[PDB]
Structure formats: structure tokens, C-alpha cells
Amino acid sequence: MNKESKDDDMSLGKFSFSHFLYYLVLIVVIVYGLYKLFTGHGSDINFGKFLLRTSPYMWANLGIALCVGLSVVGAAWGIFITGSSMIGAGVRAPRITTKNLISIIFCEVVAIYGLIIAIVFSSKLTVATAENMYSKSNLYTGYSLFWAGITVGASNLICGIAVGITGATAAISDAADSALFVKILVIEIFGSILGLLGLIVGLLMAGKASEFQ
Amino acid sequence: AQYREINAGLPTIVTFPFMFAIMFGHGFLMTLAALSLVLNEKKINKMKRGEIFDMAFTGRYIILLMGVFSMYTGFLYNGTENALLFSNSYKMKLSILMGFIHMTYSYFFSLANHLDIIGNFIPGLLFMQGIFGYLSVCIVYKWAVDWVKDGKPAPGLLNMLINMFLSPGTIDDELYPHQAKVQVFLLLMALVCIPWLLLVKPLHFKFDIMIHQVIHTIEFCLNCVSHTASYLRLWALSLAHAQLSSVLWTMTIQIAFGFRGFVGVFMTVALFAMWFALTCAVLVLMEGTSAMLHSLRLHWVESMSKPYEPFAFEYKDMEV
Amino acid sequence: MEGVYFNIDNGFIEGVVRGYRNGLLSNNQYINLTQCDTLEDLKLQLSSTDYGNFLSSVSSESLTTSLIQEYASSKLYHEFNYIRDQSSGSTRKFMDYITYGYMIDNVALMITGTIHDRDKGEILQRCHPLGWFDTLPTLSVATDLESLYETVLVDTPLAPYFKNCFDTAEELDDMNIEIIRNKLYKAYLEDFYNFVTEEIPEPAKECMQTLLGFEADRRSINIALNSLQSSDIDPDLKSDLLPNIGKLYPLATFHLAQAQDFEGVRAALANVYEYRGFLETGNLEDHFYQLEMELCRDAFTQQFAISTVWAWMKSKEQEVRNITWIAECIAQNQRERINNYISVY
Amino acid sequence: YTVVGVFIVVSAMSVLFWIMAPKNNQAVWRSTVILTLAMMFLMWAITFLCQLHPLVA
Amino acid sequence: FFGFAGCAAAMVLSCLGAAIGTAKSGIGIAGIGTFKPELIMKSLIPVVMSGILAIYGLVVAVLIAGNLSPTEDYTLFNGFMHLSCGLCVGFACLSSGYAIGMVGDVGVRKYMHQPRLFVGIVLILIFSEVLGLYGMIVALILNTRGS
Amino acid sequence: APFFGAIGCASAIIFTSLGAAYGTAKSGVGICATCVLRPDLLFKNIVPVIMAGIIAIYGLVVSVLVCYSLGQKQALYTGFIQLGAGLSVGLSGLAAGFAIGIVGDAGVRGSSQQPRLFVGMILILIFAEVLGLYGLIVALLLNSRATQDV
Amino acid sequence: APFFGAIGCASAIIFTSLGAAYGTAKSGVGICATCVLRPDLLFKNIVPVIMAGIIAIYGLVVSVLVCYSLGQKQALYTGFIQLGAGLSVGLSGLAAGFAIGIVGDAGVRGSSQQPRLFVGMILILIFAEVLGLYGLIVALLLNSRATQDV
Amino acid sequence: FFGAIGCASAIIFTSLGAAYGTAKSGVGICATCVLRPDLLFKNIVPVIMAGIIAIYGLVVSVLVCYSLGQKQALYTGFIQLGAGLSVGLSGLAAGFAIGIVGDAGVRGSSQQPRLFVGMILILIFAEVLGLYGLIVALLLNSRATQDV
Amino acid sequence: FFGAIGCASAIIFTSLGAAYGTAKSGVGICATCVLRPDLLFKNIVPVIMAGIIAIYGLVVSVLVCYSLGQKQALYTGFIQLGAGLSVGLSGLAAGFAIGIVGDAGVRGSSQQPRLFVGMILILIFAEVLGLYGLIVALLLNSRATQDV
Amino acid sequence: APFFGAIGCASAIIFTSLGAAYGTAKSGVGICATCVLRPDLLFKNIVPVIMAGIIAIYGLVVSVLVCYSLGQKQALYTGFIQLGAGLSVGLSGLAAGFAIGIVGDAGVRGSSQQPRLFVGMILILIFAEVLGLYGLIVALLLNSRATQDV
Amino acid sequence: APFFGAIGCASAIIFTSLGAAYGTAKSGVGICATCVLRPDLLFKNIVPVIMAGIIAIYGLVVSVLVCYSLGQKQALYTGFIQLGAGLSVGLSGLAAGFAIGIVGDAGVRGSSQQPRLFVGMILILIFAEVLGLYGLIVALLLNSRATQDV
């Protein structure tokens, strides 16, 4: 449909400004453009008697790839937080340079979480998962797959950020060296099951790999 | 560490170099460059130069064995390179059994030792052995001579996702029809395996520690799914390195062999340097990217036994 | 925004501050070190800390004052000038302005020391943004106002001493070091609140505003007590004027900044702290160290925040001043006055 | 014929490292051939015959 | 077919709120190195309380995913209530977890400061924790009458 | 029909849960005086979270009433009448929770020096809860006429 | 357009509750901060919170009166007066609460050091309710003129 | 028919992530090279590690260009944007973490040689996300051309 | 037919990235040129290395501009926008990394004169993204049909 | 759409005039700031503002050349290459002026201290016109490759 | 012609009046600030505002010429070249004024102590009208190519 190029250009333009927001900005839209588009978008909903709503269609299958990229960004957001703590310690004392790799193992498993769901979300060479709203009806599966992939990618991205913050806080393990740092490692290890449980709930919520009818 | 009754693990010397070569005939150049360290071991023993050449020169035996297995592992993979769906079903089933065999072989020494380390080893090995045994046994049973049956199914972890969803398991496409009672008995043994594991922990201590015993109780079930989910890194780097090597290599041999004449010999001869340079750069990139086996073997290997001390002791074990 | 804090360039400074935060001494270490009377037990007990790494390379045999200046210069230069080269983003400009708040007063003290017939190549123990031989000797030895603007403009980024140099060059407040030192001291507290107002709501920023307001009220109390019988000019820039969101208003802080010793603003600001309205310089000076040392444990319990890095410089400066004040009294075999009177370093 | 016959011939025909090595460090040399034979038994790579997927294209 | 966004929207915000609360709650465990008497058992109450909030959104997303089927009446218009029912539990779980992490960051140091002041942090954590239970009960009552 | 109006149930508890979350979050942060014997100031310092916690039940009552009044078959009368009622109680509840959250930090911070401002802070929070109570009363009055939709 | 007149009734209590909560937060913060100085001025400083909190009754009564007159058949010119009256009363109550918050904070800050401006702060803050009263009267007239049923 | 944005987005995101990682690694490498010129070869590992992510986006763009023919279909323009966007985001996050990990790893590894294993271990873990995204883009690109 | 914005976007993004890299390269070159006059010729290599990125988008837009006639199709206006956008983003990221790499290379080479080979080697490796995006735009331009 | 190609003719001169104005302002700021320290090299330091200000002649000559061949009506074929060539020339002139402004300010500030850096600042500043010349050549080729005007 | 045809006439005078106002404010600020220290640069400061007024006079003449060719109906091709020429002239005048004001304030501030840069600031200010002349010529050609509306 016509929403394919609008969703692709909106995803590319949103990912470009979102990627350039955290880094050195070289191009960005003004703040008045959001209020100008919001005023013109909300002004057409009032008049006249026509109501605005969404259109039912899948329009893409790249939600598993965006979920795998969200999990890879979640692991990459925690690996820099762990390496910043390890390199922040550095040569201040003769300690382990791989003792904080326990959180980096869960952050590396956060990239596999959702990437395994991308291979599991094929459904027998899925160009179309089933009979959908492109030339037929009953397109709830293809439209519902993107929400499960983005939900599992957001859960893996949040679990990788939480495990990365728990590993980065477990890097020094204290604000005063008087006790062991295993107490921070227990709370950091207590959050590693959210990625496995969220990936199992996301994989179970997406259903099995049905045949492409 | 380097404790008495060395070395610091039997399965590290074979699982380390054998699992390191699984990420990669591109391995012939790595075995040829690795073979210089055999003759240059005596003269290259006292060099004292470089930060990566010293640590690479320290593991001469492990790099020689891993470079020796890289020729066989690289020459074996590089089934089919056209489609990306048939090779994944064999690499997934190969790395699943290869990871489960190293996991069971690594846990057999820790369960046999019995030296955190008190309990959780005698009552365990039931759920992971039933799930991984029913998956590897279903893949080995599906790898027989055939057949009139399904294709892409399971090929592994999807069948484990089908498990724990129904008592009478009949999920496809890879499954054993003789019979489906292993899923119900494995579900009953996995359901009854939960109280017997945590029940024997406080009994052995008596003639906080409760959160340590609960974290150590759930650490086996979390570590089993963590190891089984982390076992795809062997087949992922092989499948990415094979397409990444054949993709760049496929754009040079076609234009080189198309020319002819006196100018085509110099054009193909000058064009072959980019092909050999990219062919050695792909194996050097895979060998440089294969450094995760040291941390994975140092964490999973050192976790069941009891840092850099076991890796240094593994290189010092072959020297003395 | 409250509930989540994180930064890209702030993670390197927070992780680098987290490694040196584990070696920070507590009040029990200073209380246990102040009880010991032997120099070998105090040097051996203080040698096993973050500041003891510089003393481990060169130990003191007589407890001289040059060893504390060399260890404070090596620990302040390695712990301060090392993170400035690998910094980036707005956090490097905020930490450069935080170092410029003390470097603006150090440049004025070196400028007055150059006119005072002092040395033009000697630097004392204190927090500075650069070394003691790159920018401090040119601005310290240089007496012209044109060289001071070019020396501050040559550095990256710009500091607040360049804007304050026009007021002293124009002769708008006074010809002494006191009137320029009052506005130069309040200019760093105004610039820190100006930068904290711009980059304020990235973190929660709850204890840092109260510690900055209590430090501004403590600086206004010392500025009001210093101008007592010193001929303070209310119209000239010699009175501290800094707003605070605590238990005091800006007009009460401006009236307390004058040489009147207003105990009503101190009594209305706090009723349980050390500063309550007493005119004792020893109790007010000793209570400023314990009150300024407080609130850093709440900022040191978070990660990926600029409040812990901002309080770590004041905690390291207070620990270096406590170790330098304890080393001189312990070297001569005399009892400590400020160390024995206070209870929180 | 089957892939299990190679591991049956490696396991049955193999002594299992008892002993065939010296009395010094016999655990590493004994356990090394079992792991190398275990990897060599796992190095089949058939990739066909019921899940030989590639037909078109 | 639009009912899946309400099913994924519950756990999508509940997992981010529970992870964001568990990160800030786990970040306060550094100071100040006191674990002889009760450490670490008192700080795990807010981490377990913030961790247990995602089970309501996961069970609500599992019941909402299992409830959606083509063998019942869900067309014109059954799927309208699932978006608000999932977004209410999602925003309630994220809003509860975001304040639960900041409350646990000071409650972790409050237990180390005094061993008799845990009743106030537990009483504030219960009132800051019941908001996810109210949205989980409203999401369960909304999902109960859904087809 | 269009099947529009189900967002008013989650919209009531959304801003009410966010206001109580920011209220308890901003009220829970703050140092207090410590001693060997408690002066009963810990029971006085927990009044802002308990006073701000009523907005979640107040929005949850209107959300339960709109959720029970929604039904399996939606109408334009009950759908249009149900929408808009949750945002009124959610805005006043979020504003009263945001004011009680800011008052809770100043009350806990001022309670360390002298614990005498609890009589003023309790009347400030009691006068702050009337904005959410009026929005809950308006949500109940708007939800009372939503029944019998045709 | 369509039947969407509930947003005008909700926006008046939302804006009035937001302005009243924003003024009551700054009034209670300055009252709690000024209560630590002297306990005699604690009861005198509580007048701005109760005086600022009375502005929500105009938007609540206008939202109740607009909710009681909500029809079923909506026209183009029909459902327009409710959003303008509720937005006018909400903006007037939000502006009166925003001026009453700064006037109450300036009055409490002026009376904190030496209390002499209590009648001056009460007299200056008493005139801020005229804009909310005029906006509540214009919102009451626009809300009363919406019930046409053409 | 919008499969060109998937082929351009992979090289755009991988070029941006590799450019930011090469800038952030070259800044710390150039800052650490001023102390001792012998440590340039030891400090050159972050630029070589960050520069390896461009081959994944280049081979993924070559496979996306080889899989893009004269056929026009709505299903054939969605997998390329997901594979290219996933490989671009994975290479951008891996390069963004590899740059800050390479600068702090080179600066911390310049003073003490014990942190070289931690900097190499932390910097080596960023390539797994780009390799997994390149494997997902190769698996999605392999099923994109099947005759419909 | 909307491939004109994609044809101008490669030279626009390449010129913007080349100017943004030339600003940061000229800032560090002007800051390092005050030390000694011999370092100007050594520091001049980053501006010449950064200025070579504009020839890829200029030659790509000039080569793509020659294949624009009267008869066109909607399918022939999609590959040029993706190849030009990929070449533009690759040239902008390569110029952005080459600016910080040239400024850090000139800043590190200003103190020590032996770091010129490391700054030239680290700066020379950042231009592979614009060559890969220009090669992908060349393959996408060669795979175009139905337009002229 | 007839006459849609005027946006490419106006955007090139607009972007080139804005980039030349920003480059002339950025060069004149550093020239005026560097003229106080050393007024001997003011004529040598004034070359970057005049060199940066000449970038608008390419977009003005391209807009005049495109305006000279335009009539009163045009087809849709010219309005795609015209906006691309004009946007490319405008972006190239704006990027060249934006780099020439900071290059002229840093070259003037660096050349103010040492007079030997004027050759390096003029050599590095002279290379900024290659993007505007390449964009003007691509806009000239794209404008020359158009037809069907009227 | 559909709509939006009158915006090009005010789009030039809006940006030209804003740029001339900002340049006149920036010139008068440095002139009034520099007039206190030295009264010699008082009469010299009128050249930036007097030369800045010609850019607003050219945009006013172009706005009068575009306004005289509008009427009450627009053509099909006039509403693109009109808004393009108006936006180009407005952006050129605003960039010329904004680039002229900072250079005039910096030159007037630097020329207070010792007038040596007055010939440089007058040289840059005399050459800064090339963007307004090029935008006025492009707006004159675009306005001349859009006549005969209807």
C-alpha cells in the first residue's frame, strides 16, 4: 500500500535523528515542526463529520529485525557501561580485567535474545506468514507479529540495559572498600532471568511457525 | 587456579582448540602460518617484544592445535553456500549437540568431584539431560536414512519451545514417533526435580546464606538455559564467516577468469592478489573475532571446576 | 525527568570516578589516624588508601611539608589532569568550569602573589584545571590585563575569569584583593548554579542543590564575618548574592552576606546543623567542614550522575586538606585542633 | 551406515584411554583423545536426506 | 487484528519499568560496605517487589494473547478495549517501577543508616507498589469480560 | 459502531498512577535526623505518601466504573460519555500528586531541623487533594449518566 | 463536529486543578520553608493555599454544568461553545493560579524575614481571582449558551 | 518497490557507526600516541577492530543488490529494510560502543598493560551484534528471492 | 520519477560532510600550525584526504545525471534515491569521522613529529565507507533499467 | 504541476546566499576579533570574508541561468532534476560557506599570532569552493539535460 | 491556481525586516555601548544601519512589485516562483542583516580603543550587499517571469 514508503521513510528519518541525537548532531528538524504537524493533524480530526482511524494491514515483516537491532542496541548500551567501569578502574589496583565479564555474558546473550527469535520467526520462508490483508482477509497474524517482535526486542533491550547497569554497578562493587562486592553481584544476577523469561514469553506469545498459505 | 593435582581442567584443552576452530579451505593459511611456531619455538622463546605477539607466542601449543583444527573445520564447512536455510539446520543441530556434549562433559567432572560446591550436583542433571537429551536424540533420530517426512522442523530450540506446553507432545517437524512419552515423563521429572534440588540444600548444612543458597539453586537452571542459548555462537560465526568470505570471494574469481590473451594473464594475475588478500583477510578477521572462546571456556569451564590463572595454567600444562 | 539517569560521555567520567571512589577515605579512617601519635603508624595506615599510592613511591622520614605537596600534586594531577584529555561532550565543559571556579581564585591569588614579591614558578596544593607550569606561570607572572585575557582565551574551553577580569580591569569594585576576591569567589558559585540550571534536570539533582545552597550560605557567612571591621562596601561588589532553594531566601542571603552577623537567617535556615547563629570563627569554620562534607554519601550512592563527580572533587579536596593539616600537626608531635574538634572529614 | 555407528565404533573400538600413556600426566593425555574423538565423531556434516532443504533455488 | 498491540503494550512497558526500577534499585547497593548483620537481605525487598510487577503484565499479555482467536466474536469491535486495558497496566507498571526504583535507591541506604527505619520505606514502597496491582486488577477485570 | 471510548478507562489511572508515582518518588527522597531513640518523626514523615496514595484508588474507582460501564457491546452514547471523564480526574490527580510530591521533599527536609510544619503540610496536602477529589466527583457525575447508552 | 463535548468539561477542571495545584505547591513549599523560622507565622501563611484552592470550584462547577447539559445530537456549530468556555475558564484559572503562586511565594518570602506584608500580600493576591472569576463567568455564559438543540 | 532504502540504510548505518567508532578510537589513539610512539601498534587494535564492521554492511549491501531484480512486490521490499536496518543499527551500536570502549581501552591500556585483556575483551564483544545482524540479514536475504 | 533529490543528495551530503570534516581539520591544522612552520605540510594531508570524498558523490551524481531523459518509469526512480542517499550518508559519516580523525591526528602529530604515519594511516582507513557506498551506488546505478 | 521548478531556482541562491552570509559573518567575526590584537595583517586577514562571500555567485548564476530558460509553464520532468540540482547546489554552497566561516575564523585567529600560517589558511580555505563548483557543475549538467519546457 | 499565492509577497519583507531589525539592533547596541568610551566612533556607526536599510528597502520594493502583480486571483505557476523568490529574498536579506549586525557590532566594539579596522569594517559592510543584490535580482527575474496572472 501507500503506507509502506511512509513507514519506511518515517522509520529511516526517525532512526536517523534518533541516532544523531545521542551522537554529534549534523542534521535535525526544528521544534516548531512537531507543533505545526500536530496542529494541522489535530485540526483535520475536528471537522467535519468524518472520523480518523488506523488501517488494518501488516505492511512489513522487519519487526523481528528491528527487535534484534533493539536487543543488539540494548547489549551495546550495557557493554560500554561495563567497559567504562572496567577501564575506569584500570591500573588503580591489581584486580581482574575479566571479573566483570559476568554481566557482559548476559549482555552478549541479550543480543542472541531476539536474534534467535528472528530465525524462529521465519514460518517456512515467510514472505507472507499466512493469508493476510494484501489479497485476502484474516491478517491479524502478520500485524500481530510485529508487536510481539518489537515487544520482545524492547524487553531484551531493557533487560540488557538493566543487566549492563547492574554489571557496571557491580564493577566497583561498592563506594567504600570494606566488604565484598558479591552483594551487588547478587542483585545484578537477579535481573538476568528477565531476558530469558521475556524471550520465552515473547516467543510463546508469537505462536508457532505456521505454514505460508 | 594453579592448585595442586593439576591441571585446572581436562575439557579445556580439547574443547578450547576444537571449539575455537568451529568459527571458521580458509584454514590452510592459518595452519601454514601457525606451523612456523613449531620450528620457531626454540628461537622465539626469548624475544621480549610486542604486546600481542608475546601473548600469542605464549599459547604456541593452543594456537598450533587450534590452527591445525582450523584447516579441517574450515575445509569441512567451506554443505552448501547458495541457500542460507539448509546450512542453518545442520549447523544448529551440530552446535546444539556439540554444546550439550561439552556442557555434560564439563558438568560430569564437577558432579564427580563434589568438592556453592556442596549439593545441587547429585540431584541435578535431570531436566537439562532430559530436554537436551530429547532434543539431541530427536536430531540424531531425525538424521537417519530417509524419508517421507517434514523438512526445516524443528531444528532445535523451536522444539524446546514446543516442550513444556503440552503433556502429549506431538510437535514437528523433527521428533521421534517411538515414542512421545519422553516429553510427559521429562515434564513430570522436571516438575518433580524442582523440590528435590532445593530441598537437599539446607539439610546438608545443618548437623544471609538463604539468598546464596537460592541463587545457587536457580543458578543451575539459569546457567543451563544461558549455556544452551549461548551455544549458537559457534554456528553463527561460521555461517556469517562462510557467506562473508564467499560473498567477497565470489566477485573476484568471475571477472578474473573471464579475460583471455596476453593482457588477461596480467589482469587475472594482478586481480588474484585481491582474491588472496581478501581470502587471508577473512580468515584473519574470523581468527581475530574468535576471541570469545577464551571467556566462554574460562567462564563455563572454570564455573564447573571451581580468570587468567587457568588460561595461563593450560598453556603451562603442555610445556611442563 | 526523575527515575532514570544516564549519559554517553558521562559514563566514562562516572566510571573513572567510580574507580577512585573506592579508595576514598572515610571519617573512621581519619578518626583512627588522628588517634595515632607515631608518624610510622600514621604513614603506614594512610599509605594503604587512594592517596597513599603517591606516598608509597616516596615515603616520608620526618613528616616534611614537601611530601604532602608532592603527593597532593601527583594525586591531584594524575587524578585530575588525566581525565581531562579523554573527556568530551558537555561534561568536560562542566568539569572544566568546575575546575575554573577554583582556578579563577587561584589565578587571582597568583596575580596578587606576583605583585606581592612572591615566586612566579611555585604553586601550592589546590585544585586546578591545568598544571603548575603551563598556564599558571604566565597568568601569575603576567601583570597586564591583556595577557590574562589571552591566556584564558588560549585555553579550551573558556573560563569565567575572563568575564570577571573586565570588572577588576575597569576598577568597578576596589583596588584591593578583598573586593575582587569576594566577587571572584561568588562568581564561581554563580557560574556553578548557572551551569547546573542549564544542565540541571538530566539527573534528579536533589542533594547537590541543597549542598550548593549550604555551601553558598556558608560562603556568605564567611564573607560576612570576614568583612566585619574591614570597611566593607555594600554598594560595591563585595557582598555575596546567591539564591538558594533551601530554608533561606535570596534577600536573607544578601543581608547575611553583609558584615552584620545576622543570626536570624542562620536560625531560620537550620535548627539542627552546626551553623545556627554563633559568632565563633572556630566553631563556624570547623562546622563548615563537617557540614560541607555531609550530603556526599547520598550523591555517592548513584551512578551516571554529575552530582557524585561534583561532590568527589570537594571530598577529595577536603580529604587532602585534612591529610595536609593532620600531617603537619602529626609531624611536630602537637595535638590537632581542627581535626580533633571536628568529627566528619 | 548411520551417524551413530561412527560413535559406536569410536566408543566400542576405543579403549577409552586406559591407559596407552605414561604415568605422568595421564589424565590430560587420556582425556584428550576422548574429546578429540568426540569432536571427530561430531564432525559428520551430512546436510541432506530428509532436511536436504535446497531445491528451488 | 489490532488487539495484539494492547497485548504487547502491557509487558513492553512493564518490562521497561521493572528493568528501570531494578537498575536504580540495584545502583544504590554500593554504599557503604556494610553487610555483616543483614546484608544482603534487606535491600532485596524492593528489588523483589519491583521484579514481581512484571509478572502481572506478562500474565496479562499471556491471557490477552490466548484470549484473541478467530473462533469468537472480535470483529467490530472487540479489540478496542484491549489497547486501553494493556496500556493502563503498562503505564501503571512503568510509573510504579520508575518511582519504585527511586524509592528503593534511598530505601537501600535507609536500612543501612538505621535498622529500625525499614517500616517507613516498606510503607511507602507498598503505597508506591499498589498502583501496579490496581492496574493489574483493572486489566484482569477488563480481560475477563473480553472475547 | 466505531468502538471508541475504551481509552478513558486506562486514561484515568494513567495520569493518576503517574502523579502518585512522581509524588511518592519525589516525596520518598530526602535525608532525616537519626538517633538512638526515635522521636516519632518517622510516623509523621510518612504522611505525604499516604496522602498522595489516594489518587490511585480515586482514579481506579472511576476506571472500574467506566470499565464496568463499557460492556462487550459498545455504543456511541456510553463510549462518548465515558471518554473525557478520566482525563479530568487524572489531570487534577496528577497535579495534586505533583504538588504533594514537591511538598513532601520540603516537609521531610524541614522536618529534620524542627518537626513542627506537619500541621501546615497536612493542611497543604489536604487542600491539595481537593483538586483530585473534584475531578473524581466530576468523573463520577459524568460516569453516572453514561449508563443506558443507545 | 461529533459528540465530543466532554473535553470542554474536563479541560476546565484539568486546567483549574493544574493551576491550583501549581499554586498550592509553591505556597506549601514556602509555608513549610518559612515555618522553620518562627511558629507564629505558620497560621498566617496558610491563607494563600486555601485562597488559591478556591479557583478549582469555578471550573468544577462549569464542568458539572456543561456535563449536565450535554446533548446527544451534535452539530457543527453545536459542540463548539463547551471547548471554548472550558478552555477559557481553564486558562483563566491556570493564569490566576500561576500569578497566585508567585504572589504567594513572594508574599511568604517577604513575610519570612520580617512580617509586615501579610495584608499587602493578601491584598495583592486577592485581586488575582478576578481573572478566574471573569473567565468562569464567560465560561458559564458560553456553557449556558451551548444548549440549543437545533 | 522500495528495496533500495534497505540496501542504502545498511551501508549508511554501518558507515556512520564505523565512522564514529573510527573517530572515537582515533581520538584516544592519537591522544595516547603522544606519550610514547612505540605503543602505536599496540593502540592500533581499536581502529582495526572498529573498521571490521564495514565489511558486514558492504557484503550485506552486495547481497541486497544481488537480491534486488526487476520484480516489483510489496513483500519483497520489507525484508531488505529489516535486514539493512538491523545490520545498520547493530553496526551503529557496535561501532558506538567500540569507539568509547576503544578510547578508554587504549588510554587505560597505555598506562598499565593489565587492562589490555579487559579492553580487548570489551572491544571484541561488539562484533557479535554486527555478526548476528549480518547473519539475520543474510538469512532474511536468502528467503527474499524465491520466485514469490 | 523522483530520483533528482536522490541524485543531488549524494553531492549535498558529500559536500556537507566534506565541509564539516574540513572545518574540524582546519581547526586542528590552524591550532597545530602555530607550533612550527614545518608541520603545515604534514598537517595538510587531512584536508586533501577529506576533500577526496566529494568526488565520489560528484561523479555518482554526474554519472546518474546522464541517464535522465524524457521516457522514464516509477521503478527507475527508487534505486537512485537509495544509492544517492547511501552515498550521501556514507560520505557524511566518512567526512565526520575524517574530521575528528584529522583533528586528533594533527593534534597528536603537533606534539610529537613521529605520529604522522599513525595519523595518516588512521585517517586513510576512514575513506572506505564512501568508496563502499559509491560502489553500492555504482552497482545500483548499473542495475537500473526502464529509464532511457 | 506547471511552474513547479521555481523552487530549485530559488533554493540554490537562497542556500548559497545563506551560506555565504554565514561564512562572511563568521569570517568577519574572527577578523574583527583578530584585528584588535594585530592590525598589521588586517588586509591579509580580510581575504577569507571576501573569498567566502563569493560563493553566492554560483547559485545566483545558476538561478539566473535557470530563470533565463524558463517560460510561463513547464512539465513535470524539469521539476525533478531542477529541484535536485538546485538543492544540491544550495547544499554545496551552504556547506562550503559553513566550512569557510569556521575555516576563516580559525585561520584568522591562528594567522593573527604567527604570520606564516596565512599560506596554510589560504590553501586550506581555497579548497572549500570545490563542493560549490562540483554542485554548480552538476546543477549545470542537470539543467542542461532538461527539456519539454512549455 | 489552488492557493497560497500571497505568501511570497510578505515572505520577503518579513525576513528582510527581521534581518534589518536585528542588524540595526546589533549595530545600535555596539554603537551606543562604544559611544560611552570614545565619542569619535559615534558618527561612523550610522553606516551599518543606513546601509542596512537599503536591504529592507529592496525587499519592500520587491514586496510592492509582487503585491502589485497579485490582484485577487493567482495563476497556476505563480504560487511556486512567487514563494520561492520571496523566500529566497527574505532568507538573503535575513542572512545579510544577521551577518552584517555581528560584524558591525564586533567592528564597532574593536574600533573603540584604536580606529584601525574601520576601513576593514567599512570594506566588509560595503561588500555585504551582494547577497541582497543577488537575491533582489533573482527575485526581480522570478517576479518578471510570473506576470500576467489570470
Author numbering:
A (entry chain R): 1 to 213
B (entry chain b): 400 to 423, 427 to 480, 524 to 560, 567 to 658, 710 to 808, 816 to 829
C (entry chain Q): 1 to 345
D (entry chain c): 5 to 61
E (entry chain S): 17 to 163
F (entry chain T), G (entry chain U), J (entry chain Y), K (entry chain X): 9 to 158
H (entry chain a), I (entry chain Z): 11 to 158
Verbatim from the authors:
In order to understand how SidK interacts with the V-ATPase, purified full length SidK (residues 1 to 573) and detergent solubilized and purified intact V-ATPase from S. cerevisiae were incubated together and the resulting complex analysed by cryo-EM. In the absence of ATP, V-ATPase adopts three distinct conformations that correspond to different rotational positions of its rotor subcomplex relative to the rest of the enzyme. Particle images were subjected to 3-D classification in order to separate these different conformations of the V-ATPase, as well as different occupancies of SidK binding to the V-ATPase. While V-ATPase particles decorated with SidK were found in all three rotational states of the enzyme, the highest-quality cryo-EM map was obtained for V-ATPase in rotational state 1 fully decorated with three copies of SidK and reached a resolution of 6.8 Å. The distribution of particles in the different rotational states differed slightly from the distribution observed in the absence of SidK: 49%, 23%, and 28% for rotational states 1, 2 and 3 with SidK bound versus 47%, 36%, and 17% without SidK bound. The fitting shows that SidK binds the V-ATPase A-subunit primarily via its first α-helical bundle (blue bracket) and the three copies of SidK each interact mostly with the corresponding N-terminal region of one of the three A-subunits. Surprisingly, comparison of the V-ATPase:SidK3 and V-ATPase structures revealed no major conformational rearrangements in the V-ATPase upon SidK binding. In comparison, the C-terminal region of the ‘open’ A-subunit in the V-ATPase:SidK3 cryo-EM map is well defined (yellow densities, and 4B, surface versus mesh), indicating a more rigid structure when SidK is bound.
